[PDB]
Amino acid sequence: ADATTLTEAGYVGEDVENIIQKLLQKCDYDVQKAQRGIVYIDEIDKISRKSDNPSITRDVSGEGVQQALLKLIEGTVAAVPPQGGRKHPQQEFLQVDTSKILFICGGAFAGLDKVISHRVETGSGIGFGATVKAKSDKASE
Amino acid sequence: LVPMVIEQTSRGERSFDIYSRLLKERVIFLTGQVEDHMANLIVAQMLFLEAENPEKDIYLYINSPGGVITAGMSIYDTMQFIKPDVSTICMGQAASMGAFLLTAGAKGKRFCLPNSRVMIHQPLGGYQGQATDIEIHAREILKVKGRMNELMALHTGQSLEQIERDTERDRFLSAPEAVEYGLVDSILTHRN
Amino acid sequence: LVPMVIEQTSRGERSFDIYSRLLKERVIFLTGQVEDHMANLIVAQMLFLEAENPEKDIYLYINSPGGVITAGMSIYDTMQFIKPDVSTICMGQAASMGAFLLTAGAKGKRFCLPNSRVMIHQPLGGYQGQATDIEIHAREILKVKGRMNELMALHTGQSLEQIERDTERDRFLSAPEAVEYGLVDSILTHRN
Amino acid sequence: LVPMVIEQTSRGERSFDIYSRLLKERVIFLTGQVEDHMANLIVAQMLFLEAENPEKDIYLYINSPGGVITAGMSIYDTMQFIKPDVSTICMGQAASMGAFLLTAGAKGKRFCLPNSRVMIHQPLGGYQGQATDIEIHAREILKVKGRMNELMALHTGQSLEQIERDTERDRFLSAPEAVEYGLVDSILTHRN
Amino acid sequence: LVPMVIEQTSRGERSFDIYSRLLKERVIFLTGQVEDHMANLIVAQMLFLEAENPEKDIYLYINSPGGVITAGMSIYDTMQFIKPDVSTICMGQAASMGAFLLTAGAKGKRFCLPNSRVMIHQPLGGYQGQATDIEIHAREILKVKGRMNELMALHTGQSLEQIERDTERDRFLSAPEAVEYGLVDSILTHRN
Amino acid sequence: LVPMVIEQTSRGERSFDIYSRLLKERVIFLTGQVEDHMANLIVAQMLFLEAENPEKDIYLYINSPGGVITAGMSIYDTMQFIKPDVSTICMGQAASMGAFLLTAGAKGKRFCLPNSRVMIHQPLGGYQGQATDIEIHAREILKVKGRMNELMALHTGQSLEQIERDTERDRFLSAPEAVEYGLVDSILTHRN
Amino acid sequence: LVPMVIEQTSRGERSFDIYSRLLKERVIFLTGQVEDHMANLIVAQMLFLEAENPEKDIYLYINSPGGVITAGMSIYDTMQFIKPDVSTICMGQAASMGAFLLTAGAKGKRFCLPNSRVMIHQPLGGYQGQATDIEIHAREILKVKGRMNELMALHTGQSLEQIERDTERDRFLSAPEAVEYGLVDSILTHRN
Amino acid sequence: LVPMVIEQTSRGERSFDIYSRLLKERVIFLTGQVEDHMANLIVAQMLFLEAENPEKDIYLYINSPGGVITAGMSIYDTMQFIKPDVSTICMGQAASMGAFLLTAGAKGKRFCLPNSRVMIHQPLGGYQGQATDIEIHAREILKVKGRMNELMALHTGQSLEQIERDTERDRFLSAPEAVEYGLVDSILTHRN
């Protein structure tokens, strides 16, 4: 699957329970074997918050997706519609447990190297009394 | 114009002028003739920096040829008031007022560059008017002269009599000579 | 050049000039020759701070050699009008108007640095023209002199006749001397 | 340097200069020598506030030593044209034009600080040239003098004859004296 | 310092200077000595507003002591060229060029404030050099004098002979007198 | 100051200066004394517009009293070099250099306001030094005189002999007279 | 006031000043008297462009009445030092220093407008002091003269003897004359 | 005017000044007369670059006629203290102080452009006052002369006696002459 498509519940983008729906397709819509399946989540880097956000905008593509996945990864029962359906008061739902379902979130965290480069070689001070003994080294990403 | 600099760090990147960037690192530049406006600005930086971390030291770079006395006392009093120790460093030169602020720094945290120069002299002033007014102003500057010598003697460690004799006329002291006199504690030749 | 500082607020970070950052903390800087333009700026700050929090005290830092009498009165009248107590502090020096505004501060909240100076003198003025108009302008400066001596006597606590004798000619008062005279209440030597 | 202040609004925090922040509250600052450039600025501020809320009253702080007559009349006519009542306040002083504008405020909304100094005098002018041209310009300043005295009598309430005698030479009026004359209505000593 | 104002719009909050905000409402300020640079700025505003809405009427607030004739003609020609009617309002005063531009406004939309002062005089110039060159420049200024008088007679409605007699020397006209002469149409005493 | 304006586009509201906004519509303002600095700015504007759309015309508004020949000649060569036609409109006046640029405009696109004054004269300069140097500089300015007269004849259409005689001394031409002389083509009395 | 131009691309819209927009196209403007500060700015543009692309050509528009020789050599040495070929186009004129930089451009990429004026002369200098010091400075300026002549001969292709005789006194040249002399390669008349 | 430039990054495009953009590449420009304010700016840049990468070298482009010795010594001391090797480059010229900073660069990283002119002379100064004061000041300038010559001999490698003879009067050294003298290591004819 792709994390970018996922969005917080109650919005027009998408819901996080669709991930189980995709897994259900391969298992012939059998929840028993689905509980023992493995899941992969691509492009998780786009879900990260940028910086210093008050959250008044109620970010949906970002922080909202993470908050919903929390219970999913650790394991919680999820209501998955049968096929090509969206969550609604209707009873067209399938109780699926993600406790035994492995998750592999893979993403390209562009810019993380700079964060790591900072902490490793942030340095302290700029003047004569500062400690600039740390020397920035050229290393591959 | 001052060159703008950027800090490539987390929580976003921020652009500041080179002077403001160093201020974040607790570095205050004292340059040029001392006056009320520049001295007032330095006072704000000292008071400002105290709020973030009273324990961390503040650095003051002095390359001033001297100036007004009243403006200088506003800086001296601020340095002694705040809890963080103010480390003074002499770049290029430190005249009468700059030297008084240089020696006023925290004991053991006063430095001077190897080729820097220092000079100390008595206060200079003048008044035009009636004889009665002259006596008032003449008494005032003499009190200032005595007060400044007392403070310089305290920081340097020399006796009040020695300071009076040396400050009667301009006395130029090199970086090593200043260490012996007591104006500064050590010299910064190369980074270790 | 005025440096810019960063404030870590709840709604992200904001960049403020050194003087604006202190204004947020109810600190106003009175520096240089007093005039109509700068006086109208201090008045705006005092009124703005009153609206934000009338109970909290406003701090005024006075490092000035004096100036126009009328401009200073705008500041003095504004201080008395606003409910919050204005705490005056003297850095470097406080001349005739700087001293008048200094002593005008709230009782018990007037401070002075140990190496600061104070100077009180009668008003200065002049006019060129006919004898009739000279008599007019002369009466007002004499009236202004009496008005300023009455207000200074009130804050200092000394008798009106005593203020007249001292103000006749320039007088220089040190920080401890000002405490005895009544211009200030206490001295801020070190942070406790 | 003018300080910047933060205003908290429903949309979010916004930065305003100290003078613009007070403009939002219907406060206009008249300061310094009156002239065409500053006068047009005040006129624009008045018209702008009238559109926002023609019912709320505007405030005009006056600390000025006077200036050009023509520039002042633009402000006076604008104050009378617009619907909002303009409440004039005197800070520090109010000379010939500052006083004419001060008394021009809405009846019952003219104020002055306790130590403010008001002054009223006849117009000042001059011309160099042929005798014929001198006569032309001389008649205008006389008409302006008569026109200004008529308006002062209307606002203050004093007779035209009394205004002529008092305005022949510079007359200084304290805040209480101005109340009796009619230039102002009340004194703002302290906030109640 | 020019204050900044906030305008509420569908897109959101917008910040404008006091002069730009009024420009949005089709208001152009003509202030001070007329010259090439200020005139070109006014010309740019007239053309910009013409494109936005060629049907609505533009307003011109004239408070100026006059200036260069050539710069004024650029404004006058632009007013007659563009389709929108230009309404001229005199604030404070309108000298030779300001008056020419004031009367050049659209018939019926020329206004004057009650205490305004209008003055019209003939052109003034000078040249130093050879007699041949003097004859050239002398003829040119006379042509401008005749051209200016011919245009004023058209707008004011007075005969050409009458204009020559009145403009031979400086003539000051009040707001009511200007209405009779034909320079303006009505007076804006109060908001209705 | 220059008043900002808002331009509506597909992206959203955008802010532009009054001059920059007109530059977007291929309008360049030539104002004041011609000098190297302003000329290079006009040249840059022309080259920029050529890249955006070499087919669309460019409108140069000329209101200037003339200036340096070298600086003005950099604008003339730029106009002829670029493919788009450069229309020239005279506002207020166009002196010797302003007139050369005015007549240098594209044939049929040169315009003039009805009250604009176009003056043409021969080059003027001076040198101090040795006789040998004077001969060098005297020959150069005379060569420039023939070059300018040759080009002026080409654009106006008059013979070189007539241009030489007419430009031997200052010659003032009104907007209609300029049409017959060939400096311009039509007069923009009113928008049609 | 330099105008602002908007560059529109798929990524977004960016606003640049007219001079900066042309800088993206490797166009550097040399205007006015040559000096250390302006020359340093030109040097920074050459290094910046070299870093962006060391293969694309750089254009230099010259309009300047010469200036300091030392400042000019910094530009000349920089042009030869960097790999990119620096094209030179003379607009308006190119005096002693401008002409040296003009002819210093890459062979085959030196242009001039048809009406440009190019003047070349020997260095100008002066010294006041002792006879011994005069000999030192006099020898220095003569060495500079010979060095400049050698470089000009190399670029122009003329013999050293011919350049010495021609540069003894001011020698004004035209665009066609410069082509045969060797200062420039071609003349840009029309884009075709 | 300083032309701004845009750089492309993964996070996004950022606008930078021309000098600030080069500062990111460890390039500092020493231009004009040396003084306290400009020197402090160079010191701040050297320290800022040391923190970013103490191993990468720094490139200082020098083009100046000299100035204050105290200000220059601040730069000289800073260069030696910082770990990065400061590669000095002489553009145009390098006088007494400019040359002292040029030769102060790291051994093997001192360059000079081919047409640059280097100059070295002894310090110059003066004092007006009593004979006793003259003796004190004369001793200080002589000490500075000995200290500067001692350091020049160290960097250049020549004997102290030879430096004294050469520096007694102004000595102009071309780029090749400076290489053999020891002021610079090699000439930068081309990038390759």
UniProtKB/Swiss-Prot annotation, chains B, C, D, E, F, G, H:
CDD domains in the record: S14_ClpP_2
Induction: By heat shock. Part of the clpP-clpX operon.
Main location: cytoplasm
Effect upon mutating residue 17 to A: No ClpA-ClpP or ClpX-ClpP complex forms
InterPro entries in UniProt: ClpP, ClpP/crotonase-like_dom_sf, ClpP/TepA, ClpP_His_AS, ClpP_Ser_AS
UniProt xrefs under PANTHER family: ATP-DEPENDENT CLP PROTEASE PROTEOLYTIC SUBUNIT
Name the UniProt record assigns to this protein: ATP-dependent Clp protease proteolytic subunit
Species for this entry: Escherichia coli (strain K12)
Lineage: Bacteria, Pseudomonadati, Pseudomonadota, Gammaproteobacteria, Enterobacterales
Gene designation per UniProt: clpP
